[PDB]
Design a protein. Structure first.
Ligand SMILES: *[C@@H]1O[C@H](CO)[C@@H](O[C@@H]2O[C@H](CO)[C@@H](O[C@@H]3O[C@H](CO[C@H]4O[C@H](CO)[C@@H](O)[C@H](O)[C@@H]4O)[C@@H](O)[C@H](O[C@H]4O[C@H](CO)[C@@H](O)[C@H](O)[C@@H]4O)[C@@H]3O)[C@H](O)[C@H]2NC(C)=O)[C@H](O)[C@H]1NC(C)=O
Ligand SMILES: *[C@@H]1O[C@H](CO)[C@@H](O)[C@H](O)[C@H]1NC(C)=O
Lengths: 107, 385, 120
């Protein structure tokens, strides 16, 4: 199994402040990786696939970066409409796994 | 699919498959045009349009640097070598200008290079049209604080394809492992597949297995020319279909003799494919995959043989090693195991925990009787078709 | 626009079997691959099963194997999930989710979500 560790577990930041979330993979998965956003009590909506692209219908402040077996999501500018929990999932082959999840709060 | 558990040796044979082979490649070049944006500049303080404009202007420079680094003096190396050769052929200025002139009035031109290839070229101009028509008129005396949030959203929605292409090409040293939806859209891929020289049956087969078609291809960056991006992307060609073919999955046949092990492992494992002219043999497991009742192998890694499949070189490729080995031969409709080696082997079920603990001796199974097989706390999955 | 809806089976007693369905509509069934996923409250999502496009791999998570029988049905464009033995720990929300084309295997066009509880 391809375990994933996510850090930090929870964080708080002001509006207009850069926020970073790092996902680490147990073994190399090249560039097959997806991110997700889940508001409380709703279905998750896709944000970034292939660790660098940008799926349609998404504001252009969600940019991701790859570095070997380390991935990172960086929100350019936090907004009041961005309170949710972000996951990261690999899709190397059968099967797929998720992460523990990071909670983002605003001030 | 009819899996025949061979009754006189620990190596089964199968039949009933219809094969499809990768017989070639179909080149396809694009001329994604950004549009003239270097002139436009906003100095009014941070805003919404400013961020997107700076992002596009930085992406152009990043692609230029990536292309400058690119020029160096899932698939076998034949694909990448052919792609590199075609890219080198395309790179030269005379035919670059020829392609640019061909794609000036229409959006479909089946041109030809100096050599003989099909380099059907399609151009996309949504971003260039937007920038030339609406953005320049909307911007007035360098005023980026315009209340048209609709226009800002339109810019964000329009530059997405170019930004994604730049990022994907920069992240993998100029060659992408597979064809993303951004590299070619659905309609463009359908047209390109339908326009290449293959029969209607193969055309329908590809219109069905678009997923496999898009997973087997790849793309290469050509370079930046002024204010445009030019890249090339290839599509695998399935030329010969509907041929009977078979796979041999062999395991050692070891008989315990109170200390001495007498195994029997043939070395002819793989997929044998009798097309028009001869019979081909693919040794590596990665060449062929099972797509329901069919099998997809690539002809670029095939070997030629003439007469075989009697189970009996000519006395058949077979060894008589005395050192046994334990693993699971996951055939599409069964599993064959020769785990003696003082080990534990058993049978699992999709609803019951432990049923029919497996004894040793190159056992026998009729698919549905089990869904997982365990060998000393090891998990093996049976493909349930 | 692909729309996914759920089916109703709220309470299921321990030692019994639960079954729900996700009726896909709008798109066609045999073009791209389909999968399930689940989430117990107060934790993160975990993957359960999937049906690769035409491979019919019907793979499952290694831990929850020998317990599930994910199956598709081309007749009226419906997929069902059936459970073998329900315990007092499988209470969760069950999502049905599609997959997509291309190479990165990104799950989009999820479902509404249905709560399933275990109790006496
Ligand atoms: C919007 O953006 C577009 C491009 O997207 C600009 O169009 C270009 O504008 C530049 C301005 O510098 C033009 O460059 C000029 O080209 C000439 C020299 O290069 C020519 O060489 C031969 C001529 O023998 C031609 O065959 C060849 O095509 C080139 O055009 C000269 O006219 C200019 O240099 C002279 O003036 C400059 C003053 O800036 C001096 O510094 C030089 O020493 C020299 O005296 C100049 O380099 C370019 O040709 C244009 N391209 C096209 C395709 O038209 C628009 O101008 C820009 N709009 C605005 C408002 O900025
Ligand atoms: C661009 O301008 C054209 C011509 O007036 C107009 O029809 C169109 O709606 C505009 N597009 C956007 C996205 O504003």
């Amino acid at each position: 199994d391809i375990q994933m560790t996510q850090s930090p577990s929870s964080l708080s930041a002001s509006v207009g402040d850069r926020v970073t979330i790092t996902c680490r993979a147990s073994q190399s998965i090249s560039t097959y990786l997806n991110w997700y956003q889940q508001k409380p009590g709703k279905a998750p909506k896709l944000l970034i696939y292939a660790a660098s692209s940008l799926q349609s219908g998404v504001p252009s402040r969600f940019s991701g970066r790859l570095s070997g077996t380390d991935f990172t999501l960086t929100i350019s500018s936090l907004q009041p409409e961005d309170f949710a929990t972000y996951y990261c999932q690999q899709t190397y082959s059968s099967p797929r796994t998720f992460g523990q999840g990071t909670k983002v709060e605003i001030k | 699919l009819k899996e025949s558990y061979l009754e006189e040796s620990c190596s089964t044979i199968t039949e009933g498959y219809l094969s499809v082979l990768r017989t070639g490649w179909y080149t396809n070049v694009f001329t994604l045009e950004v549009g003239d944006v270097e002139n436009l500049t906003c100095t009014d303080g941070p805003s919404l349009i400013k961020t997107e404009l700076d992002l596009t202007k930085s992406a152009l420079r990043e692609l230029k640097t990536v292309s400058a680094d690119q020029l160096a003096r899932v698939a076998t190396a034949a694909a990448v070598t052919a792609g590199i050769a075609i890219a080198k052929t395309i790179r030269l200025e005379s035919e670059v200008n020829a392609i640019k002139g061909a794609l000036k009035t229409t959006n479909e031109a089946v041109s030809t290079l100096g050599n003989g290839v099909r380099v059907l070229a399609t151009a996309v101009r949504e971003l260039k049209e937007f920038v030339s028509k609406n953005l320049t008129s909307a911007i007035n005396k360098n005023k980026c604080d315009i209340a048209d949030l609709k226009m800002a959203v339109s810019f964000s929605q329009f530059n997405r394809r170019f930004l994604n292409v730049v990022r994907q090409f920069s992240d993998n040293a100029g060659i992408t492992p597979a064809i993303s939806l951004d590299l070619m859209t659905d309609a463009e891929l359908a047209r390109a597949v339908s326009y290449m020289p293959t029969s209607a049956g193969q055309i329908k087969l590809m219109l069905e297995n678009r997923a496999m078609v898009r997973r087997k291809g790849f793309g290469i960056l050509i370079g930046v020319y002024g204010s445009s991006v030019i890249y090339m992307v290839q599509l695998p060609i399935f030329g010969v279909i509907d041929t009977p073919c078979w796979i041999i999955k062999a395991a050692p046949s070891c008989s315990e003799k109170d200390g001495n092990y007498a195994c029997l492992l043939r070395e002819d494992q793989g997929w044998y494919c009798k097309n028009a002219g001869s019979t081909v043999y693919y040794p590596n497991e990665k060449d062929c995959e099972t797509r329901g009742d069919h099998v997809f192998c690539d002809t670029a890694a095939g070997i030629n043989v003439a007469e075989q499949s009697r189970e009996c070189n000519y006395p058949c490729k077979v060894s008589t090693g005395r050192h046994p080995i334990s693993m699971v031969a996951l055939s599409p409709l069964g599993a064959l195991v020769a785990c003696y080696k003082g080990v534990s082997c058993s049978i699992g079920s999709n609803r019951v925990g432990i049923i029919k603990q497996l004894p040793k001796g190159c056992s026998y199974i009729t698919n549905q009787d089990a869904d997982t097989v365990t060998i000393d706390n090891t998990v093996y999955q049976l493909s349930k078709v | 626009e692909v729309q996914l809806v759920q089916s109703g089976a709220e309470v299921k007693k321990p030692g019994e079997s639960l079954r729900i369905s996700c009726k896909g509509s709008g798109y066609d069934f045999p073009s791209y691959w389909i999968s399930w996923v689940r989430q117990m409250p107060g934790k993160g999502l975990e993957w359960m099963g999937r049906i690769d496009p035409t491979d019919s791999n019907t793979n499952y998570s290694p831990s929850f194997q020998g317990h599930v029988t994910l199956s598709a049905d081309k007749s009226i464009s419906t997929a069902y999930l059936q459970w073998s033995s329900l315990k007092a720990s499988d209470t969760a929300i069950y999502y049905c989710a599609r997959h997509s084309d291309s190479w990165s295997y990104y799950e989009d066009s999820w479902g509404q979500g249905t709560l399933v509880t275990v109790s006496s």
